[PDB]
Structures are given as structure tokens and as C-alpha cells.
Structure 1
Amino acid sequence: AAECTVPIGWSEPVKGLCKARFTRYYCMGNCCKVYEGCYTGGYSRMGECARNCPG
């Protein structure tokens, strides 16, 4: 398993209570982590997150 672990001092995104499902990609220090639900913040695409997250 190579996945993206939320680092020390970082938080999970806070899910909204909206009735929409979005897919968002958050830079968790050094890797991008994907969340689906009423999430905002982060990036809309994997490529955008990857280009803005240490590699």
C-alpha cells in the first residue's frame, strides 16, 4: 500500500452538510489525497494538486 497519509500537524477536510457530491484533491504536505462528498477547498483535479504539492 502506497497511499497518502495525513501528516503530523495536518487535519482532515471538514465535510460540509450540502446535498452535493464533489471530488476534491487536497495537498497533505507532500501528497495529494482524494475526498468525495460535500467538500470544498483543495483542487478540482488530480493534476492541479500534483503540480502544487511537493513531489
Structure 2
Amino acid sequence: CTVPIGWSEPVKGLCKARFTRYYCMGNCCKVYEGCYTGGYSRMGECARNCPA
């Protein structure tokens, strides 16, 4: 999944956890590692909800 330059990505949390979350970025789900509470914990759950 390639996110174009300028796209609005998820807001980085201030906490210092490294959760793995999958977020829909336009056409496809991309993995985000950090203090993220949004998106989905399972890639397939993101994918069936992407686009949105």
C-alpha cells in the first residue's frame, strides 16, 4: 500500500506504545506502528472496510 506525499495519515499519539494498527489510506490499508488507537488490529478487518 503506497500513500501519496501530502496524504493525511493518522495522528501520532503522544504515548510511547508500539501498537500495530491497520488504517485505510485511500484505496488500501497500511500498517502503522506506534501510539495508535484507531484503525483495526487485523489487516483483513481494515481491508474489508477500505476504501471508506
In which range does the TM-score fall when normalised by the shorter chain? 0.7 to 0.9
Conserved? CA contact 1:31–1:50, under 8 Å: yes
Q: Which moved more, 1:5-14 or 1:20-29?
A: 5-14
CA distance in structure 1 between the aligned counterparts of 2:6 and 2:17, rounded to whole angstroms: 29
Quick one: which of 28, 32, 36 aligns to 2:33? Answer: 36
| TM-score, length of structure 2 as denominator length | 0.78
Structure number having the greater strand percentage = 2
Question: In 2, Cα distance between the equivalents of 1:51 and 1:22?
Answer: 21
Higher Cα Rg: structure 1 or 2? Answer: 1
Aligned residues: 52
Q: How far apart are residue 6 of structure 1 and its match?
A: 2.2
> Percent identity, aligned pairs only?
98
TM-score, length-scaled by structure 1: 0.74
C-alpha RMSD of matched pairs (Å): 2.3
